[PDB]
Each structure stands twice: as C-alpha cells, then as structure tokens.
Design an enzyme around this catalytic site. Structure first.
Site, mmCIF file in Angstrom:
data_model
loop_
_atom_site.group_PDB
_atom_site.id
_atom_site.type_symbol
_atom_site.label_atom_id
_atom_site.label_comp_id
_atom_site.label_asym_id
_atom_site.label_seq_id
_atom_site.Cartn_x
_atom_site.Cartn_y
_atom_site.Cartn_z
ATOM 1 N N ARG A 99 -1.123 8.044 -3.997
ATOM 2 C CA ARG A 99 -2.020 7.072 -3.367
ATOM 3 C C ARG A 99 -3.363 7.709 -3.012
ATOM 4 N NH1 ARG A 99 0.401 4.548 2.025
ATOM 5 N NH2 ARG A 99 -0.631 6.401 2.903
ATOM 6 N N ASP A 100 -4.411 6.884 -2.925
ATOM 7 C CA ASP A 100 -5.730 7.288 -2.422
ATOM 8 C C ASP A 100 -6.277 8.465 -3.244
ATOM 9 O OD1 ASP A 100 -7.871 6.916 -0.556
ATOM 10 O OD2 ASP A 100 -7.092 8.560 0.685
ATOM 11 N N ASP A 124 -7.934 0.021 -3.070
ATOM 12 C CA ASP A 124 -8.569 1.211 -3.675
ATOM 13 C C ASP A 124 -8.074 1.623 -5.058
ATOM 14 O OD1 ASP A 124 -9.953 1.292 -1.209
ATOM 15 O OD2 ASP A 124 -8.593 2.867 -0.453
ATOM 16 N N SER A 135 -5.785 9.363 3.159
ATOM 17 C CA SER A 135 -4.678 8.412 3.103
ATOM 18 C C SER A 135 -3.655 8.712 2.017
ATOM 19 C CB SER A 135 -5.203 6.978 2.985
ATOM 20 O OG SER A 135 -5.721 6.555 4.240
ATOM 21 N N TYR A 184 0.808 -1.218 0.000
ATOM 22 C CA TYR A 184 0.000 0.000 0.000
ATOM 23 C C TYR A 184 0.850 1.281 0.000
ATOM 24 C CZ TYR A 184 -3.941 3.111 1.185
ATOM 25 O OH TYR A 184 -4.881 4.113 1.214
#
Ligand SMILES: OC[C@H]1O[C@@H](O[C@H]2[C@H](O)[C@@H](O)[C@H](O[C@H]3[C@H](O)[C@@H](O)[C@H](O[C@H]4[C@H](O)[C@@H](O)[C@H](O)O[C@@H]4CO)O[C@@H]3CO)O[C@@H]2CO)[C@H](O)[C@@H](O)[C@@H]1O
Ligand SMILES: *[C@@H]1O[C@H](CO)[C@@H](O[C@@H]2O[C@H](CO)[C@@H](O)[C@H](O)[C@H]2NC(C)=O)[C@H](O)[C@H]1NC(C)=O
Ligand SMILES: OC[C@H]1O[C@@H](O[C@H]2[C@H](O)[C@@H](O)[C@H](O)O[C@@H]2CO)[C@H](O)[C@@H](O)[C@@H]1O
Ligand SMILES: [Li+]
Length: 360
Positions: free
Chosen positions: A90-91, A137, A97, A85
C-alpha cells in the site's frame, strides 16, 4: 437505488470517529471548542477499513448499528460509507501509510480473502445501502509513479486486485467509487489522458460492474471545489480546482466507455488557499479547515455528493524522523508537527480544522 446512491438516504456518522472526538479531543478543549467538536463528531465521514482486523470488528459493528437505527425508523434510512484501503504494498510512493501486507509475503491472497469476507458481510447486510471508496491513491500512483520501484513492482498486483474488488463487491445495494486522486495529481494535462485509459480499462476488464458509479476525488487532500482565483501553488495547471479537473476528466473517460459520476472530499478544504507552499505537499497540511458538510445537493451534473472521506484529526503520517514509516513530506514547514502515526488521533490538527471550519 436507483440513480445517485446519495439520494433518499442519510449518511451514517460512525461511532468510532465520534468516540475519538469525545474520548480524545473534548477533554483537551475550551468550552466553546468542545461545543464545536460535538457538532463535528456528528458529521458523517467515511469509515476506513485500513486493517484486516476491522472487517469482523468495526465494519460488521457499524453495519449492525445502521440496521438497528433503520429498524428503529430512521427517515430517510441511513446508508453506510466505508473506504477499502488495504492493498498489499500500500501507499507505494510514500512511507507514511505503508500497510500490514506485502506482495512478497502472500499479500495478494490475503487481500482476496479480505475482499471475499467484505463481500459476505455486504450480502448479510444487503438491507443497508453501502457506499464504498476503493483504495485511495492506488491507481493515481499507477498513472504518475511508475518510476518509483515499489509502485512499478506492485503495478500488476494492484490492477489484478482492483478488478477483483470491483467484481466481488458488485452487489445491487452497493455503490463503488474508484479513487482518482485530485486536480493537482491527475488533473495535470500530461496525466489526464493516461488516467482516462487506465480507469476505463480497469472498468471494462471488471465487466463494467453496475455497482461502479464512478470516481472519488480530493480524498485526504485539500483542493477547492470551485474557486475564482487559482492558488499560487496550482500554477501552471489549468485544472486548478476539483471542478476543473472533473469537467476535463469526465468526457475523456466517457469516450472510453466509462460514464463516471463523482464524489469530492470536502473534509479538509474549507480554507482556501491552504497553507501549502507547493501543491505536492499532502501531509497534515497547515492552515486548513473542515469544509462543506456532506450533501447530495451539489448543484453540479457530474457530482453525486460532497463527502468527508478522510476523517479530519486522524494523522496522515508521523513526523518522528526515527520511525519506520517516516516520510519527509510529514516534516515540511507546511506540515503540522509534531504528528503521530498515520491514522492515529492528532489533537493539534483537529483543533486547526475546527478553528478554520468554513462554513463555521
Ligand atoms: O493526496 C494524498 C496522497 O498524496 C500522495 O502524494 C501525491 C500528491 O497528493 C499529489 O499532489 C502529487 O501530484 C503531483 C503529480 O503526481 C505530478 O505528476 C505533478 O508533476 C507536475 C510538476 O509538478 C510540474 O512541475 C510539471 O511541469 O508538470 C507535472 C505534470 O506533468 O506534480 C504534482 C504536484 O506535485 O503526487 C503525489 C504522489 O507522487 C501521497 O503519496 C499519498 O500518501 C497521499 O495519501
Ligand atoms: C483477516 O481477518 C479474518 C477475519 O475477518 C481472518 O479470518 C479468520 O481467521 C481466524 C484464524 O485466526 C479464524 O478463527 C476465522 O474463522 C477466520 N475467518 C473468518 C471469516 O472469520 C483472517 O485470518 C485474516 N487474514 C489474515 C491474512 O490474517
Ligand atoms: O490505525 C488505524 C486507524 O487508521 C485510520 O485510517 C487511516 C489510515 O490508517 C491512514 O494510513 C490514512 O492516511 O488515513 C486513514 C483515515 O485517517 C482509521 O480511520 C482509524 O479508524 C484507525 O484507528
Ligand atoms: Li496518505
């Protein structure tokens, strides 16, 4: 392994989650809730490699701990469970996040080395069956959120890096499950077909790696596995629980050459319906409990295991409106507040999950 990577192994319950519970939760609890929290500290949840620093610290640490336990004669032997992750940007559809790396600032190369080093450690620990969830995600955002600038901009990078991870971590002792959102995300009839093409295309472009076992669903989310009555917030989605989603999804994937098995995150879905007022509310959701304990005994042909991926008690996002990573979803009436930064221990939430645990 063999077939189901969850067959013939115990799942390791990592020291970092247990330490959090003992160091940060137990002192604040009653005698009875401290007892229940001690049982939960022992239930195996996935360990997240959410920062590059984790690779040569917590990740290698846990691998060494597992080898030691297995060498001492663990029977069945322990398997490690980890989440990759740390994609750059990211996100992409949210604030809570956002990660350490950005595409603009050499993020793709940083990620490739992160993957490379993970590969090295997996080779070093080839004696330890290792189960990975790849990038929660990320691909679900690619299906539904191309209208969001950060996502569309990251799209080509996400796809290149996902293929890279699947190829690099494709080792005989490893099983990978690509994250595939949940029934309320990709289970919608309008999202399920483009999802099937995207996942099948990533799978084929990665060369159909043997280590890719299938998909993870419900990660850091709250849906029922199987419920008779569709929660009001699920209407009008015919795929109102993870069972409906996975049964509709699997043949579409199969038709495009990806014969996927599934794992479902049951760490925060014990109480149904949840306290969600709308289905799209994901942050620190009120009225939730620890759910079905992790097991390979699912009774369903497509599901390898029910697992705890999101560690209950670690926040989904801060409720501090002045914080850089503030996301309005974490400030809604069905979000538990005040809440700390994503990943940080969130006592009040941990307490909720204990009280609402189901099974108790
Ligand atoms: O799961 C944790 C993760 O969540 C991310 O946020 C996700 C939500 O989890 C998910 O529920 C939400 O799903 C959307 C979906 O993307 C939409 O396509 C869908 O649109 C529906 C619409 O609601 C209906 O009115 C219409 O008739 O049908 C369409 C479908 O065609 O709505 C659902 C439910 O709201 O998607 C979110 C992402 O945008 C967070 O971003 C992440 O940080 C969390 O970790
Ligand atoms: C990601 O973490 C790795 C360690 O896992 C870092 O690689 C090390 O960098 C330091 C320099 O500070 C060296 O002492 C090590 O020898 C490097 N390699 C390894 C394999 O340990 C890496 O620098 C980090 N990546 C980023 C972008 O910061
Ligand atoms: O800050 C590191 C902290 O993060 C935890 O991973 C989080 C991640 O940071 C968050 O963005 C996402 O929503 O949830 C995961 C799991 O809670 C990690 O598990 C911790 O070990 C770590 O201390
Ligand atoms: Li999240």
């Amino acid at each position: 392994y063999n077939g189901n990577p969850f067959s013939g192994v115990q799942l390791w319950a990592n020291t970092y989650y247990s330490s959090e519970v003992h160091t940060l939760a137990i002192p604040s609890l009653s005698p009875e809730l401290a007892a229940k929290a001690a049982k939960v500290a022992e239930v195996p949840s996935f360990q997240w490699l959410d920062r590059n620093v984790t690779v040569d610290t917590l990740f290698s640490g846990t691998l060494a701990e597992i080898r030691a336990a297995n060498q001492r004669g663990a029977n069945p032997p322990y398997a490690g469970i980890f989440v990759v992750y740390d994609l750059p940007d990211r996100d992409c559809a949210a604030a809570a996040s956002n990660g350490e790396w950005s595409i603009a600032n050499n993020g793709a190369n940083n990620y490739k080395r992160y993957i490379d080093r993970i590969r090295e450690l997996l080779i070093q620990y080839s004696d330890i069956r290792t189960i990975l969830v790849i990038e929660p995600d990320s691909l679900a955002n690619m299906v539904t959120n191309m209208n969001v600038q950060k996502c569309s901009n990251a799209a080509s990078t996400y796809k290149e890096l996902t293929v890279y991870a699947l190829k690099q971590l494709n080792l005989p002792h490893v099983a990978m499950y690509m994250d595939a959102g949940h029934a309320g995300w990709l289970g919608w009839p309008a999202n399920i077909q483009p999802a099937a093409e995207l996942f099948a295309q990533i799978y084929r472009d990665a060369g159909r790696p043997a280590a890719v076992r299938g998909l993870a669903t419900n990660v850091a989310n709250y849906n029922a596995w199987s419920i008779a009555s569709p929660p009001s917030y699920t209407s009008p989605n015919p795929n109102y629980d993870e069972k409906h989603y996975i049964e509709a999804f699997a043949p579409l994937l199969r038709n495009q050459g990806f014969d996927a098995k599934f794992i479902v995150d049951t760490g925060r879905n014990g109480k149904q319906p949840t306290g969600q007022l709308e289905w799209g509310h994901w942050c620190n959701v009120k009225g939730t409990g620890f759910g079905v304990r992790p097991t390979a005994n699912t009774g369903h042909e497509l599901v390898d295991a029910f697992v705890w991926v999101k560690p209950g008690g670690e926040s989904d996002g801060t409720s501090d409106t002045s914080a850089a990573r503030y996301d309005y979803h974490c400030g809604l009436s069905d979000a538990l507040t005040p809440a700390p930064e994503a990943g940080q221990w969130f006592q009040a939430y941990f307490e909720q999950l204990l009280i609402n645990a189901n099974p108790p």
